[PDB]
Structure formats: structure tokens, C-alpha cells
Amino acid sequence: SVKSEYAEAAAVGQEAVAVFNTMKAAFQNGDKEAVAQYLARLASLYTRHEELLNRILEKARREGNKEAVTLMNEFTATFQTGKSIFNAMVAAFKNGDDDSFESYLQALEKVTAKGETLADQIAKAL
Ligand SMILES: CCCc1ccc(S(N)(=O)=O)cc1
């Protein structure tokens, strides 16, 4: 069901949460070889989450679940803000700009610790 597909997408999101926090620790410790691998892992995880979210949105639209569509449209937009910041963080790493990496990292935590409520609402709407 769309609801179980969202829980699957939810767990995939939690996987990025865990990998991000161990990446943050590695960055602080200066373990750039670890950071690089974690950033690659995160890119895969964020791509996967987005693909699952698109499928769920398309399914809610086919189902005519107007409230779920509204929430998912808002959530997908928020996801994209996160992704743009993530990609900027990756570029900061390639460039060796630790000051921008720190900024982008802290912005991305704010984007995710703000969209949490909406993510929980969607579970209850589908
Ligand atoms: C690239 C990060 C995109 C992103 C992932 C997860 C959430 S949350 N805490 O489920 O609202 C928001 C943005």
C-alpha cells in the first residue's frame, strides 16, 4: 500500500540521518577519507528517498487523496531545498572550503529538523 511504501521511504530517510551524523563526527575529526565515502553514501540515499517520494506522490494523485497530495507537494519542495544544500556541501568538500562546508551542513540540519513535522503528518494522511 502507499502507506507501507511511505514507511519504507521513511526508513531509508532514517538511514541518511544516521550516516550524516557519523559523517559530521568524521568532518570534525578531520577524517576526510571517511567524509568522502559518507558523502557518496548519502548521495545514494538521498537519490533513493526522492525516487520513493515521487512514486508515493504520483500514487496519491492517482488515488485522488487530495490532502495527501497537498502535503506531499509541500514536502517534496522542502526535500529539494535540502538536496540543493546537500549538493552545495559536497562541492564545498571538493573545493576544500571548510567554512562553507560547515555553513551548508548547519543549514541542512535546519532544513531537516524543520520538515520533520510535515513528514510525520504525511504518514497520518496516506
Ligand atoms: C537532502 C536532504 C533532504 C531532506 C530529507 C528529509 C527531510 S524530513 N526530516 O523528513 O522532513 C527533509 C529534507
Which string of b and e fits 80-97 if b means at least 16 CB within 10 Å? ebbbebbebbbebbeeee
How was it solved? X-ray
d(CA 86, CA 37): 14
Q: What angle do CA 62, 115, 5 make, to 5 degrees?
A: 40
* Resolution of the experimental model, in Å, one decimal: 1.5
Domain ranges of the chain: 1-126
For ligand 1, atom 6, the nearest C-alpha belongs to: 112
Which string of b and e fits 44-62 if b means at least 16 CB within 10 Å? ebbeebbebbeebbebbee
Q: How far is residue 27 from each of residues 21, 66, 89, 91, measured CA to CA in Å?
A: 10, 42, 12, 14
For ligand 1, atom 1, the nearest C-alpha belongs to: 83
How many angstroms separate the alpha carbon of residue 34 from the centre of ligand 1? 22
- C-beta of 104 in contact with ligand 1 (< 6 A): no
